[PDB]
Design a protein around this ligand. Structure first.
Ligand SMILES: Nc1ncnc2c1ncn2[C@@H]1O[C@H](COP(=O)(O)OP(=O)(O)O)[C@@H](O)[C@H]1O
Ligand SMILES: Nc1ncnc2c1ncn2[C@@H]1O[C@H](COP(=O)(O)OP(=O)(O)O)[C@@H](O)[C@H]1O
Ligand SMILES: Nc1ncnc2c1ncn2[C@@H]1O[C@H](COP(=O)(O)OP(=O)(O)O)[C@@H](O)[C@H]1O
Lengths: 419, 28, 442, 443, 436, 132
C-alpha cells in the first residue's frame, strides 16, 4: 500500500537550496521545526517550492551571454530589422585632433609625408629600384615585377583575402618542399589511400571520437561590441567608422552571397565567376551547437532538473501498461508545469479539475491532478510528504491500493517525513 | 496521417545527378 | 612496434587477493611495492576516491617506472594514464600552474553514451545541388536495401563526405549519423557502362538485407582537457593537436565542470578517473609543489603517482634541502611506496626475461657472467650489454650467445666506474672543470 | 556512489544564531575561536559595505586553514563570488603578475543584472533577398535587403533585414523550415533547428526537432544574469558579440591576456553604477582566497598594498604555513608568515591551533563515515595513535588502503590487521626520511 | 559618484587648509601632520599655477603616517578634469612593455589638453512621426513633429534622417537628441506619458552646446601612432610607441597652444612604493623630469636606508642620491594619542559605527600600543560582533572580543616564536606530529 | 610504396558532350567529357566523368596544354603548354613544358621516404582548411 520512495537532489536544486539557506539564514533548525509543526510561512513555502521544482521558483529562460549593448529597443506590410548595437562605453574625441592630425589639410602635411614615405622612398619601387625588383623576381619567381610594391603596401587581411595566384615561374629559386608535396597530393584525394590517410588523422580523430554531435559546454558571460568613438559635429568620423566596422570586402569575405543572387549576377547579369567577390572564408565551427553562444531551454533537461519529476517520468515509463492517478496536494502553480511536461514529448491522455464520471467511463485517460467516490482508480501517487494525516486520509478516501509519497533526501521534506 | 516533406528549393543552383546508367552535370 | 626498456611488463602480476607472484607478467621481485601498487590500482578502479598523492621512492635502476608501467598496463583501456616528466612543466607559452592543470585534466576521462543511426545500403541515386561558387550545397540521396528504399536530405558535411571517396550508384555504403562517417563498403551493381576516368577496383559486396536504419548506442571516452580546449575558442580542435592552448581561463573550467556534473546527473555521461604519473618529480619548482598541494584537494583530481630517485637533496626554487627533493607539506599529503634493491637471483631473472623478450638466446655461463656483471656494476649495464653481445654472436655466425661474446661486449663498451677510473688516470687528456686540457701528445 | 575529496565532509562553519561555535557540527571539529572569527568575517562580507578588508589565516600544516576558507565559501552561498587561488598561479607567461592579481580582484566582485531581450523567434517560411542593382561597386554588397517570414504559435510576421543581420542569419546556415531565434540586442542568431511540422525521419545530420515557439514574434523577455566585473573588462578589452568585422575577426584570433587599462575599468565602473542607479542591477562583493601566500614575491605584495586601498576591492583571505621566514624576492627581510610588515599592518591575523588526540580521532571517524567505511574501535584507536605519532593527513589518507585491504579479504569492517598492513605497505614522511638517512645509493 | 564602497581613504575629501595655506587641526577628513599638509598645499598650488614643470617631491616617513592619505588629499583637492595618475612601483615591470616605455606612458597620462568646441544639438520630445512609403521603396518621405516645453515644430525629413530614425526606433512620446552633422540619434527616454521616464526638455531647440574635452597626451600618442588604434587605450596593447610620434605630438601641442585652440593642463603622477623601481628606472626618471611637458611627480616610500633594486649597495629611502638631488622631501611624522583618537572617530563616523566613549578610549589605547591600521580594522569587526548580539552600539566587550579573535603583528610574532616547531622555517623544517 | 596510375600528355580536344533529353532550366547538361590526350608514341581518347569538367574550368585547361590526371582522384593538373603550341610568337608568359615521354596511361610504383616529424608537422597544421 504506502510505498514512500526516495530521491536525491540535483545540482540546480542543491544550488537553489544553498542560496536559500545562505540568503535566509535565521536559525535554519528553527525553520526545520517550524516546517515540522504546521514572516515565517513564506520561507517554508519557498523552500518547498525549491524542493518541488527548480523552475517552480523562477522559469529557466535562454542561456545567452549578457549583451553589453545599447540598441534601438521598442518601448511599446513589413517591419524592418536593422543592426543597431553600440557599446555603452563612449570615447569622446575632439574635432581638432581628427581634423589636424589624421585628416589631410592645407596646413597639414600627412598626405605629402605619406606619399613620400610610402611611394617615393619605397625600396620596391620599380621606377627607382628596378635591380632589387629583378633580383626578387628571380628569387621568388613572380611573373610581375610590381608584386613586391603591391604586397608591401597593402593591409595583411586585405592581402589574405585577395591571394588568388595561379602561375609561377619554373626558373626560380623557390622550391617545392617535401611536406608541401604531401599537402598537394592529398588536396583532393579519396580515403583509404596510404598517403591520403597518413596525412588525414585529425579528421579521423574527429570522426572516431563522435565530435560531430558533442554538446556545447562553455559560453561567455558578457558579449560586447567595440567601444564606439563619437566625434560631435563631423560626418567624416561617422563615414570612416562605418567603413571600418562594416568594410564590404571583409564583410563579404566572412559570409556568402545567396545562391539565387549568384544566379542573378552570373546568368542574368553576365558577371563571370572570376570577378565575383571572395566569399566563404569564415571558419567552420565544430558543430551546429558551437555556432552560437545562445542556448535554448531543453525540454529533456527540464525533466532531469527536478529529481521528483525525473523519477515520476521514469515511473510513467515503467507503469505505462496500467492505468493510475496522480495527486499533487496543496502546492499550487505546479499544474501548468505538468501540462507542458506531458504535452510536449510524452503525450498522455489527461484531464484537469463531471470529470469524475468521465474517468469512471473512459479508462484510456491516464493522469489525475485534483489539488487538495473515485473507486474506479487503481493506483495512487502523491506529491507531498507526511503532513497532518486528516487531509491525507481525506485524499485517500477517493482511493488495488498502491501509494507513492515521492520523498526527497537531504532537505526539509524528508526532515518532516521523518518527524 | 503523414507529415509532409520539407520544401526543397534548388533555384539557381547547378545540379550533379548520379544515377544507375549515366551521370549528369547540369551547369549554367 | 619496437622493443623498449619496459616492453616485457604486461601488468602487475598479482592474484585476486592482491598478492604478488614471485615472477608474473614480466615483473619479478619487489613484492611489497607491487602489493602497494595493486592497492593503488584497486583504489583507481573503485573511482570514488579522488586526489590522492602517491610517491614511489628508491635508488636508481630499481623499478619505480617499471612499477608505474605495470600499473598502466594493469589499468585497462578507456582509463587515462598521463605519464609526464618533471621537465615538461617548464614552458614558454604556458605557466607552470597552467601546464600542471592541463596535466591534471588530461588524466580525468568522461565516458559519453551517444545514440547513433546506422544506414547501410545500395545507393540508387545521388542528387547534389550546389551554388555557382560551390559554397552552399544541398541535395537528396535515394538509398535502398532489399526490403525498402528511402530518400534522405543531405547537408553540407554529408555531401562533402560523399564527394571524397566518390560514391556512384550501385555502391553499398554505410552512414554513421552521429559521427558523419561515410564508409564505402563496395560496389554491388557492376554496370556495363564503365568510364575511363576512375581507376577504382572496388570489390563485389552482396546486397544488404533487413531494415535500412539500425539504432545503436555507442560509447566513447573524452578527457576533460579536450573539453576545455574545444570550448576555449572556435578552432580548439586544431589546438588539441598543435598545442596552442595558451592559458585557458578559469571561467571555461568552471562552466565545463558544471556541464560535466549536469551530464553525470542526466545519465548521458559518466566520469572515470585516471593516473597522472610524474617521473623525476624532484625537477619541479616550489611553486609547482604549492600548486600541486592545493590542486590535489579538488573533486576532479586524479590519482597522482610520482617517482624520484634522490635522497635529502636541494629543492628547486629554494635554498634548503628536503627529503626526496620535496617539501614537507607535499610529503604530508603523500603516502610513500619504498622500492628496494635486488639480489643475484632477481637480477638473473630480470636479465633472463629481458633476453627472452629481445629474442636473444643465452647460455648458462653467459647468463651467470651477465648476472655477475649486473651485480657488480649495474643491472641496466648488463641489460644493454645483452643486445650488443647478440650482435657480436650473430657476427660470429652462431645463433646463441656464448661467454666470449659477453666478454667482448664488456671489453668494447664501458660502464660508469671503468670510465671514471680511465678519466681519473688520464686527467690531463680531458677538459676539467676549469677548462684546461693537453691536446698535444708531447 | 559519490566521489569524495579532502574537503567533502565540510558543510559550513557550523555556528549558532549568536555566533558561538558548537564543538562538533558542520563537519568541523575544534578550532572554536577560528570558526567564530571566520563567522564574524562572513557577517562582514554579508554586510556588503566595506572594501579591501583583508585577513590572514595563520597556523601550521594540516590545521584547517583551507577548511575554514571552504567553510566561508559554503556559508556565503553560491551567489557570492568565491575565487580560490594559489600564490603560484599569479606567475603567468602571457601578462604581468600585477595584472593577474587585478583580474582576480575584479573576478571576485559580482553583479546581478536584469536584462530585457528583444527577440524575433519563429519558423522561417520564406527567405528572399533583394539584389543590389550594381553588385560590383565595391562600396555596398550583393544584396540590399532580405525578406524573411517567421511564424510562431498564433502569430506570423515578416522582417526586412539589412545585410549585416542576414549575414548573421546565413552564418548559422538557416534554410526554409528552421525555427530560429534572433536576438536584437547584439544581432546574434540562434538556429533552434528543424520544425516538427514537416517530416522528421528523412534527415542525415542528427538534427533536433522543435515545436513552434509560444507567444507572438518580437517578444521582450527578462533574464536574470550573474556576471563579474572581470567578465565585463575582458569582454570590452577583447570585443566579441557585435556583427562588425572587428568583433568577428577577434572571435577567430587566439585569446591572450592583456594589461587592461584603468580607463576601461573606470568606464566599466561608470556603466555598472548607471545600471545600479536605474535599479536594474545589484552589486555582490565576494571573496578572493589565496592559499600558500608565501609563494608571492615582494612585487605582488607591494601591488597588494595599493590594491587593497581601492573602493571596489573584495574581501581577501590568505593562508600561510610559514613562521619567521624571508620574503620571496628579497634577501634579508625576515617577516612573520612570509608576509611583509607593510601588508601585515593591513591584515587581521586569525590564528589556527593544532589538534589533540581525541579531536584527531573524531576527525578520522568523520572522514571514515563520509567515505562509507566501517572501522572497529580498536582500529580507530590505532589510527588515532598513528595520527598523533606521524601526522593527521597520513592517518586520513590511509583509510582508503585500509578499505581496499578490507574488501580484498571479503570484509566490510576495518580490523587492526588491515591498518597494520597499511602501515607496513605505505610510509609517512618521517619513516621515509629515516630510510633516506640510513641508505648509501641516495634512496 | 560611480562605484564606491567604504575604502581606507574614503573619509578624505581633500586638504583641510585655509586661504593662507594654513592647515586646520581637523578639516575635510584630515587631522594632524601640519607641516606635511602645508607642504602638500604648496605642491597643490604649484600644480594649480601650471607654470612649473617636472618637479619631483618625495613623501617619506614611517608606515601608517599618512603618505597615501596626503596623496589622496591632494588628488581630492585637485578637482575634476586634472589628470591624477596613481600607480604602484611594481606596475611598470611589464611583459609587453619596457620599463622606460611604461614610465613614459605614466608620465604622459598626467598631462592633459583642454579643447572647447561647439555643437548644434536638437533635444526634444517627439509628438509624432509620419513616413509615407513609395510604391517600390526607392524614395521615402516623412514628417517629424517634435516639441519642447516652449516650442513645437514640424520637420520635413530626408532619406538619411528616415533611415536613422527607423533604426533606433522612435515612437510618439520619446525624448530624443539629434546631432545634425554626425547623424546620431540618442533616445534619452520615454516622456511623462502614463499609458525609462524622463521629463520633457526646456525650449529653444537647435541649441549651441559647449563641450570641454580634456584628452591626455598618452591618448594622442596612441591615436597619432597609425599602427595603434584607440582600442589599445582600453585593451592596453599599445606596445612601445615610437619616440618620433611623441615629438610630432609635442610640436603639434605647442603650436596649438600658440594658436590658442587648446590649453595645457598639468597634473600629478603619484608613485606609491617608489623604492620598488630599479636603478635604470631612476635614471630614466632623472632625465624625464626635465621635459617641458612633464607633470609633477609625487613619490611615496617608507623604507629607510634600504638596498636599491638593481644594485648591490644601500641608499637612503631606497633611492640613489642623483634622484634625491632632483627632489624636495616632505617628511611625515607619527601620531600621538589625540590624533589617533580623532582618526578612529572619523573612521567610525564614516562607516556608520556608533561606539561608546570608553570603547573609543580602548581602541585608541590599542592603536597607540599596536598600530592605527589594526584599530581601524578592528572597528568594523567589533561592529559586526555588536550587531551579532542585537546591539546597535559598540561597547567595550565588543572591542575586547574583536581583540581576542583577531591578532595584531606583535602578538602573531610572539605566538609564532613560542611555537616555532609547528611552523615552516627558513630551512623547510616542521614537526607536524603532536606527540613523541 | 604506392601505385600511381595516371593519364598525362598534351591534349587534343575537349568536347563536353551533351546528354539526350537534357532536363530543363539548365544550359549544357554534360553526359560525359571526352578528352583526347597524346604523348610520345601514344594517343588515347578518354571518356571522363562530367564533374571533372568544372576542374577543367578550375585549372584553365585549353587545347594544346599538357595536362595530368590521376585515375583514383580524377583531378587534372595543368603542367603547361606544349613546345609545338607556341603560337604567340611575340609575347607570352606561359611555361612551355616538353611533351611527356612514354605512353599516356602509365601505372608506376613509387617509393616515398618521409620522417615521423614530417608527418607530425603536416598533420599539426590545418590541411587545406580554406578559411581566413
Ligand atoms: N620488478 C621488475 N621486473 C622487471 N624488470 C624490472 C623490475 N624492476 C626493474 N626492472 C628493470 O630495471 C630497469 C630500470 O628500472 P626503471 O624503473 O626504468 O628505472 P628506475 O628504477 O631507476 O626508476 C628497467 O629497464 C626495468 O625494465
Ligand atoms: N577542524 C577540523 N575538522 C574537521 N576536519 C579538519 C579540521 N581541520 C582540518 N581538517 C581536515 O584536515 C585536512 C587538512 O586541512 P587543510 O586546510 O587542507 O590543510 P592546512 O590547514 O595545512 O591548509 C583537510 O582535508 C580537512 O578536511
Ligand atoms: N592625517 C590623517 N588624517 C586622516 N586619516 C589618516 C591620516 N593619516 C593616516 N590616515 C589614515 O590611516 C590609514 C593608513 O595610513 P596610510 O595613508 O596607509 O599611511 P602610509 O601610506 O604612510 O602607510 C589610511 O586609511 C589613512 O586614511
Amino acid at each position: 500500500i504506502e510505498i514512500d520512495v526516495l530521491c536525491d537532489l540535483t545540482q540546480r536544486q542543491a544550488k537553489l537550496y544553498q542560496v536559500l539557506k545562505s540568503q535566509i539564514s535565521t536559525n535554519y533548525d528553527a525553520i526545520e521545526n517550524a516546517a515540522t509543526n504546521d514572516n515565517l510561512i513564506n520561507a517554508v513555502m519557498q523552500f518547498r517550492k525549491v524542493c518541488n521544482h527548480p523552475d517552480l521558483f523562477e522559469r529557466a529562460d535562454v542561456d545567452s551571454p549578457f549583451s553589453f549593448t545599447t540598441f534601438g529597443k521598442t518601448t511599446s506590410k513589413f517591419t524592418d530589422l536593422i543592426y543597431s548595437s553600440r557599446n555603452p562605453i563612449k570615447y569622446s574625441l575632439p574635432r581638432l585632433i581628427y581634423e589636424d592630425l589624421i585628416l589631410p589639410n592645407y596646413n597639414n602635411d600627412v598626405d605629402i609625408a605619406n606619399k613620400l614615405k610610402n611611394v617615393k622612398f619605397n625600396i620596391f619601387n620599380p621606377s627607382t629600384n628596378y635591380e632589387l625588383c629583378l633580383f626578387l623576381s628571380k628569387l621568388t619567381g613572380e611573373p610581375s615585377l610590381n608584386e613586391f610594391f603591391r604586397v608591401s603596401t597593402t593591409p595583411l587581411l586585405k592581402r589574405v583575402i585577395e591571394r588568388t595566384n595561379g602561375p609561377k615561374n619554373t626558373d626560380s629559386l623557390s622550391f617545392k618542399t617535401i611536406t608541401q608535396e604531401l599537402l598537394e597530393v592529398t588536396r583532393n584525394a579519396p580515403s583509404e589511400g596510404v598517403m591520403a590517410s597518413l596525412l588525414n588523422v585529425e579528421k579521423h580523430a574527429y570522426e572516431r571520437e563522435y565530435l560531430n554531435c558533442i554538446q556545447r559546454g562553455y559560453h561567455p558571460n558578457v558579449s560586447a561590441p567595440p567601444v564606439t568613438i563619437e566625434v560631435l559635429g563631423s560626418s567624416h568620423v561617422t563615414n570612416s567608422i562605418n567603413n571600418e566596422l562594416f568594410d564590404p570586402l571583409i564583410s563579404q569575405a566572412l559570409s556568402d552571397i545567396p545562391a539565387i543572387t549568384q544566379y542573378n549576377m552570373h546568368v542574368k547579369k553576365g558577371i563571370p565567376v572570376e570577378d565575383f567577390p571572395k566569399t566563404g572564408l569564415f571558419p567552420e565551427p565544430l558543430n551546429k551547437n558551437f555556432s552560437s553562444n545562445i542556448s535554448m531551454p531543453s525540454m529533456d533537461r527540464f525533466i532531469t532538473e527536478s529529481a521528483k519529476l525525473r523519477k515520476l517520468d521514469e515511473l510513467l515509463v515503467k507503469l505505462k501498461s496500467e492505468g493510475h492517478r496522480v495527486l499533487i496536494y496543496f502546492q499550487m502553480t505546479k499544474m501548468m508545469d505538468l501540462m507542458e511536461e506531458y504535452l510536449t514529448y510524452r503525450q498522455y491522455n489527461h484531464i484537469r479539475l463531471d470529470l469524475v464520471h468521465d474517468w469512471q467511463t473512459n479508462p484510456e485517460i491516464f493522469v489525475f491532478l485534483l489539488s487538495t467516490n473515485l473507486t474506479a482508480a487503481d493506483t495512487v501517487i502523491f506529491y507531498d510528504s507526511d503532513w497532518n494525516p486528516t487531509i491525507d486520509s481525506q485524499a485517500m478516501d477517493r482511493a488495488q491500493v498502491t501509494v507513492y509519497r515521492l520523498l526527497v533526501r537531504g532537505t526539509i521534506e524528508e526532515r518532516m517525513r521523518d518527524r | 496521417f503523414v507529415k509532409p516533406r520539407r520544401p526543397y528549393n534548388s533555384e539557381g543552383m547547378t545540379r550533379i545527378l548520379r544515377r544507375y546508367e549515366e551521370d549528369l552535370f547540369c551547369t549554367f | 612496434s619496437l622493443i623498449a626498456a619496459h616492453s616485457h611488463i604486461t601488468g602487475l602480476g598479482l592474484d585476486e587477493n592482491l598478492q604478488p607472484r614471485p615472477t608474473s607478467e614480466g615483473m619479478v621481485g619487489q613484492l611489497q611495492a607491487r602489493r602497494a601498487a595493486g592497492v593503488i590500482l584497486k583504489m583507481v578502479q573503485n573511482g570514488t576516491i579522488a586526489g590522492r598523492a602517491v610517491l614511489v621512492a628508491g635508488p636508481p635502476s630499481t623499478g619505480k617506472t617499471a612499477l608505474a608501467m605495470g600499473v598502466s598496463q594493469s589499468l585497462g583501456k578507456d582509463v587515462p594514464f598521463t605519464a609526464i616528466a618533471g621537465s615538461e612543466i617548464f614552458s614558454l607559452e604556458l605557466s607552470k600552474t597552467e601546464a600542471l592543470t592541463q596535466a591534471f585534466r588530461k588524466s580525468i576521462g568522461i565516458k559519453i553514451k551517444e545514440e547513433t543511426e546506422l544506414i547501410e545500403g545500395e545507393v540508387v541515386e545521388i542528387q547534389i545541388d550546389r551554388s555557382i561558387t560551390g559554397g552552399h550545397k544541398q541535395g537528396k540521396l535515394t538509398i535502398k536495401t532489399t526490403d525498402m528504399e528511402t530518400i534522405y536530405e543531405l547537408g553540407n558535411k554529408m555531401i562533402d563526405g560523399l564527394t571524397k571517396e566518390k560514391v556512384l550508384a550501385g555502391d553499398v555504403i554505410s552512414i554513421d549519423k552521429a559521427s558523419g562517417k561515410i564508409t564505402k563498403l563496395g560496389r554491388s551493381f557492376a554496370r556495363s557502362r564503365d568510364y575511363d576516368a576512375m581507376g577504382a577496383d572496388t570489390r563485389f559486396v552482396q546486397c544488404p538485407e533487413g531494415e535500412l536504419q539500425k539504432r545503436k548506442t555507442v560509447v566513447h571516452t573524452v578527457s576533460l582537457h579536450e573539453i576545455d580546449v574545444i570550448n576555449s575558442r572556435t578552432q580548439g580542435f586544431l589546438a588539441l593537436f598543435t598545442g596552442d592552448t595558451g592559458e585557458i581561463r578559469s571561467e571555461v573550467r568552471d562552466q565545463i565542470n558544471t556541464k560535466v556534473a549536469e551530464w553525470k546527473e542526466e545519465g548521458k555521461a559518466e566520469i572515470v578517473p585516471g593516473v597522472l604519473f610524474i617521473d623525476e618529480v624532484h625537477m619541479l619548482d616550489i611553486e609547482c609543489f604549492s600548486f600541486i598541494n592545493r590542486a590535489l584537494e579538488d573533486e576532479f583530481a586524479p590519482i597522482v603517482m610520482m617517482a624520484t630517485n634522490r635522497g635529502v637533496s636541494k629543492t628547486r626554487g629554494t635554498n634548503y634541502k628536503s627529503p626526496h627533493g620535496l617539501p614537507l607539506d607535499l610529503l604530508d599529503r603523500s603516502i610513500i611506496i619504498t622500492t628496494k634493491s635486488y639480489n643475484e637471483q632477481e637480477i638473473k631473472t630480470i636479465l633472463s626475461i629481458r633476453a627472452q623478450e629481445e629474442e636473444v638466446e643465452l647460455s648458462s655461463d653467459a647468463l651467470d657472467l651477465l648476472t655477475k656483471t649486473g651485480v657488480e656494476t649495474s643491472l641496466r649495464y648488463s641489460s644493454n650489454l645483452i643486445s650488443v653481445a647478440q650482435q657480436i654472436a650473430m657476427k660470429r655466425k652462431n645463433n646463441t650467445v656464448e661467454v666470449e661474446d659477453v666478454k667482448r661486449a664488456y671489453l668494447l663498451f664501458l660502464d660508469s666506474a671503468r670510465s671514471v677510473k680511465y678519466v681519473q688516470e688520464n686527467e690531463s687528456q680531458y677538459i676539467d672543470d676549469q677548462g684546461n686540457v693537453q691536446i698535444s701528445i708531447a | 556512489v559519490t566521489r569524495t575529496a579532502a574537503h567533502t565532509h565540510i558543510k559550513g562553519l557550523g555556528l549558532d544564531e549568536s555566533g558561538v561555535a558548537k564543538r562538533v557540527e558542520g563537519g568541523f571539529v575544534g578550532q572554536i575561536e577560528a570558526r567564530e572569527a571566520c563567522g564574524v568575517i562572513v557577517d562582514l562580507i554579508k554586510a556588503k559595505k566595506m572594501s579591501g578588508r583583508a585577513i590572514l589565516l595563520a597556523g601550521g600544516p594540516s590545521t584547517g586553514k583551507t577548511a575554514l576558507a571552504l567553510a566561508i565559501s559554503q556559508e556565503l552561498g553560491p551567489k557570492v563570488p568565491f575565487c580560490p587561488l594559489v600564490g603560484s598561479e599569479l606567475y603567468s607567461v602571457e601578462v604581468k603578475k600585477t595584472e593577474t592579481l587585478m583580474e582576480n580582484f575584479r573576478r571576485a566582485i559580482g553583479l546581478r543584472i536584469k536584462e530585457t531581450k528583444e527577440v524575433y523567434e519563429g519558423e522561417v517560411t520564406e527567405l528572399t533577398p533583394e539584389d543590389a542593382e550594381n553588385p560590383l561597386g565595391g562600396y555596398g554588397k550583393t544584396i540590399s535587403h532580405v525578406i524573411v517570414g517567421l511564424k510562431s504559435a498564433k502569430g506570423t510576421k515578416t522582417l526586412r533585414l539589412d545585410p549585416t543581420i542576414y549575414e548573421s542569419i546565413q552564418r548559422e546556415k538557416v534554410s526554409i523550415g528552421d525555427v530560429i531565434y534572433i536576438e536584437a540586442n547584439t544581432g546574434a542568431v540562434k538556429r533552434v533547428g528543424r520544425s516538427d511540422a514537416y517530416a522528421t525521419e528523412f534527415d542525415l545530420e542528427t538534427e533536433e526537432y522543435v515545436p513552434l515557439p509560444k507567444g507572438e514574434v518580437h517578444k521582450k523577455k527578462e533574464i536574470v544574469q550573474d556576471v563579474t566585473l572581470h567578465d565585463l573588462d575582458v569582454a570590452n578589452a577583447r570585443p566579441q558579440g557585435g556583427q562588425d568585422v572587428i568583433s568577428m575577426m577577434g572571435q577567430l584570433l587566439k585569446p591572450k591576456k592583456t594589461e587592461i587599462t584603468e580607463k576601461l575599468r573606470q568606464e566599466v565602473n561608470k556603466v555598472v553604477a548607471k545600471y545600479i542607479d536605474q535599479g536594474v542591477a545589484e552589486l555582490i562583493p565576494g571573496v578572493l582566497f589565496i592559499d600558500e601566500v608565501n609563494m608571492l614575491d615582494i612585487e605582488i605584495f607591494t601591488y597588494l598594498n595599493k590594491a587593497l586601498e581601492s573602493n571596489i576591492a573584495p574581501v581577501v583571505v590568505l593562508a600561510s604555513n610559514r613562521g619567521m621566514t624571508t620574503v620571496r624576492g628579497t634577501e634579508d627581510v625576515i617577516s612573520p608568515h612570509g608576509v611583509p610588515p607593510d601588508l601585515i599592518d593591513r591584515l587581521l591575523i586569525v590564528r589556527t591551533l593544532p589538534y589533540d588526540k581525541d579531536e584527531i580521532r573524531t576527525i578520522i571517524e568523520r572522514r571514515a563515515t563520509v567515505e562509507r567505511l566501517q572501522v572497529e574501535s580498536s582500529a580507530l584507536d590505532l589510527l588515532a595513535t598513528m595520527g598523533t605519532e606521524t601526522s593527521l593527513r597520513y592517518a586520513l589518507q590511509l583509510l582508503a588502503p585500509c578499505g581496499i585491504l578490507a574488501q580484498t579479504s571479503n570484509r566490510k569492517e576495518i580490523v587492526v590487521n588491515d591498518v597494520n598492513e597499511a602501515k607496513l605497505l605505505f610510509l609517512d614522511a618521517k619513516r621515509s626520511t629515516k630510510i633516506l638517512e640510513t641508505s648509501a645509493n641516495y634512496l
